[PDB]
C-alpha cells in the first residue's frame, strides 16, 4: 500500500513552477522545453499545471464570492 496524495506533482516541481508562475503568467513552447529541462517533465502536464494556477488566480482575483 502507498498513496501519499492524489497529486500528480512533486514539491520541488510545484516550487519552480510557483517561482515561475510568480516570474511569469504565460510561457512559451520554448521557456516551456526550458523549464521541463530543468525539471524533467512534459509541457502538457506543465502547461495544464500552469493553467490550472491562472484558473485559480482568474477566479480569486477579487471577483468570486457574491455576498450581495
Given at each position: ?53 491562472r ?14
Amino acid at each position: 500500500m502507498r498513496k501519499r496524495g492524489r497529486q500528480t506533482y512533486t514539491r520541488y516541481q510545484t516550487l519552480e513552477l510557483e517561482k515561475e508562475f510568480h516570474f511569469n503568467r504565460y510561457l512559451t513552447r520554448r521557456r516551456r522545453i526550458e523549464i521541463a529541462h530543468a525539471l524533467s517533465l512534459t509541457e502538457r502536464q506543465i502547461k495544464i499545471w500552469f493553467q490550472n494556477r491562472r484558473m485559480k488566480w482568474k477566479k480569486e482575483n477579487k471577483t468570486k464570492g457574491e455576498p450581495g
